[PDB]
Amino acid sequence: EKTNRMNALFEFYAALLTDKQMNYIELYYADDYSLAEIADEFGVSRQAVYDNIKRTEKILETYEMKLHMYSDYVVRSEIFDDMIAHYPHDEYLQEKISILTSIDNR
Amino acid sequence: EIEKTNRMNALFEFYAALLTDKQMNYIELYYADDYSLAEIADEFGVSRQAVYDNIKRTEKILETYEMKLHMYSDYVVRSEIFDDMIAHYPHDEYLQEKISILTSIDNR
Amino acid sequence: IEKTNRMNALFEFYAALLTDKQMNYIELYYADDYSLAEIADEFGVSRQAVYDNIKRTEKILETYEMKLHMYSDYVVRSEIFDDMIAHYPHDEYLQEKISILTSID
């Protein structure tokens, strides 16, 4: 249970999470532990880790419904790609897109 | 017929040092000293066609350097951002002095 | 060969000017952290050949830096950007401008 969108929601909103909401999912998304490894580290069950992570995932979705940083990031990249495809030899536009893209990736 | 432009003049100023002597001598007289193709050819004892083809060769080389290093487009962007900053801080003398220092490192 | 932040940066600024033959080894050395031995094993050559070729590319990079000054201009601007941030530590719009200027570079 790992997807690019949810990974992205985690990267966008992690700073909004509490410690308790954060711990497991951070280990899973950023440090790369399996749920078993997380359960072993904490002396808890595998389902427990699964349950905690699922709750935080709904929270991340709630933030996405409110702020839309992910859907808006997707829309912009698609528009930037169209622009690039449209103006393959315009240096000034390519640099603009380069800066926007970097602002979006930060 | 070779059309001078501000971008091309700027690529030359940015990348001149990368050119070999033969790549640089004619285009330098053309842009920096406003020589005609005929005058260059007369000075060096060669045909106008030869000067013409040489300058076109360099122009392509300059355009390849820009595609690799982007000193010109980066310079355009920096000045736009500096202009933004000046409009944002109309009366900040300190900011104004900084921008003026950055601008001159950019103008060398 | 002592690695430095400066040479790393020279490589990063001018690599596009290098031929594959000038770039192959130094690229592995700096970007991928290969040792000279690993590089030599990969290309089936001696360590000395690897050592000579990197030293040569380094010299070529130093030449680009002396002609173009991209790295020194970057170090000087950075210093000017640091003065500005020290001057206005709580100015987000300024901070943002500086991050962009810095990434352009």
Alpha-carbon Rg for chain C in angstroms: 18
Q: What separation in angstroms does the CA of A69 have from each of A25, A58, A80?
A: 19, 16, 16
Q: Token pair 């290969």 is at which residue?
A: C34
Specify the DSSP class assigned to residue B1: -
Q: What are phi and psi of C88, to 5 degrees?
A: -125, 75
Q: What separation in angstroms does the CA of B83 have from each of A95, B19, B78, C33, C87?
A: 17, 32, 9, 41, 20
Listing DSSP states for A38-86 in one string gives HHHHHT--HHHHHHHHHHHHHHHHHHHHHH-HHHHHHHHHHHHHHHHHH
The amino acid present at B30, given as its one-letter code, is: Y
Residues of chain C with C-beta less than 8 angstroms from the C-beta of A102: 100, 103
Round to whole Å and give the CA distance between A4 and A21. Answer: 20
Round to whole Å and give the CA distance between C19 and B106. Answer: 28
Q: Reported resolution in A?
A: 2.3
Helix orientation angle between A4-13 and A46-67, rounded to the nearest 10 degrees: 70
Helix orientation angle between A91-104 and A69-86, rounded to the nearest 10 degrees: 170
Can you say whether the dihedral through the CA atoms of B34, B35, B36, B40 is positive or negative?
A: negative
Round to whole Å and give the CA distance between B21 and B16. Answer: 10
Q: Token pair 């001598």 is at which residue?
A: B25
Task: Give me the total of CB pairs closer than 8 Å, taking one residue from chain A and one from chain B.
Answer: 15
Q: Token pair 């349950």 is at which residue?
A: A51
The amino acid present at C70, given as its one-letter code, is: M
Q: Which of residues 67-96 of A touch B (CB under 8 A)?
A: 91-92, 94-96
Structural tokens at position C81: 């950007």
The amino acid present at A3, given as its one-letter code, is: T
Contact B105 C76 (CB under 8 A): yes
Round to whole Å and give the CA distance between B18 and C81. Answer: 29
Instruction: Answer yes or no: are the C-beta atoms of A49 and A24 closer than 8 Å.
Output: yes
Domain annotation for chain C: domains and CATH numbers? 1-105 (1.10.10.10)
Q: What is the 3-state secondary structure (H, E, C) of chain C?
A: CCCCHHHHHHHHHHHHHCCHHHHHHHHHHHHCCCCHHHHHHHHCCCHHHHHHHHHHHHHHHHHHHHHHCHHHHHHHHHHHHHHHHHHCCCCHHHHHHHHHHHHHC
